Amino acid sequence: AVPKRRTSKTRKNKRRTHFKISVPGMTECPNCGEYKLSHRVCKNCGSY
């Protein structure tokens, strides 16, 4: 029910090894405009 001992800095930081986010798909809109998300459509700010 309750923690018996406090958690140290090193154990807390080991537990957060996998707690991250990843970079998205990001294909480039060739005809006009900047990057867009892949398999998506950007009617404005992109020709694709």
Partner RNA sequence: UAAGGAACUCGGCAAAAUGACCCCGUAACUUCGGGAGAAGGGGUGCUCUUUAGGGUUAACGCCCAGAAGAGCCGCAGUGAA
Partner RNA sequence: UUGGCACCUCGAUGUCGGCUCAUCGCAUCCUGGGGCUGUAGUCGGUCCCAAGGGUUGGGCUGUUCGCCCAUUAAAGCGGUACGCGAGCUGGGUUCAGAACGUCGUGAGACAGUUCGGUCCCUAUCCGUCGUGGGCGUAGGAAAUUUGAGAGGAGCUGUCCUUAGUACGAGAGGACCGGGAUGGACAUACCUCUGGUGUACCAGUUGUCGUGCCAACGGCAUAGCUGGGUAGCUAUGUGUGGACGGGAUAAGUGCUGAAAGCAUCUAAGCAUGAAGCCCCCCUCAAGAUGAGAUUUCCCAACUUCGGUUAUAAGAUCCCUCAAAGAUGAUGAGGUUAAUAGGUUCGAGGUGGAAGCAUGGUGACAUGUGGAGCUGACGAAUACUAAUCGAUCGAAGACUUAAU
- Does position 9 bind other proteins by CB under 8 A? no
- Does position 16 bind RNA by CB under 7 A? no
Piece of 5-13, 14-22, 27-35, 38-46 that binds other proteins (CB under 8 A): 38-46
Which residues, at least 6 apart from 28, have a Cβ–Cβ distance to it below 8 Å? Answer: 34, 35, 36
Rg (CA), the chain: 21
Using CA atoms, how far apart are residues 40 and 45, in angstroms rounded to an integer?
13
Binding site for RNA (CB under 7 A): 1-5, 7, 18, 25, 27-28, 30, 38-40, 48
Give the interface with other proteins as residue ranges (CB under 8 A).
37, 39-41
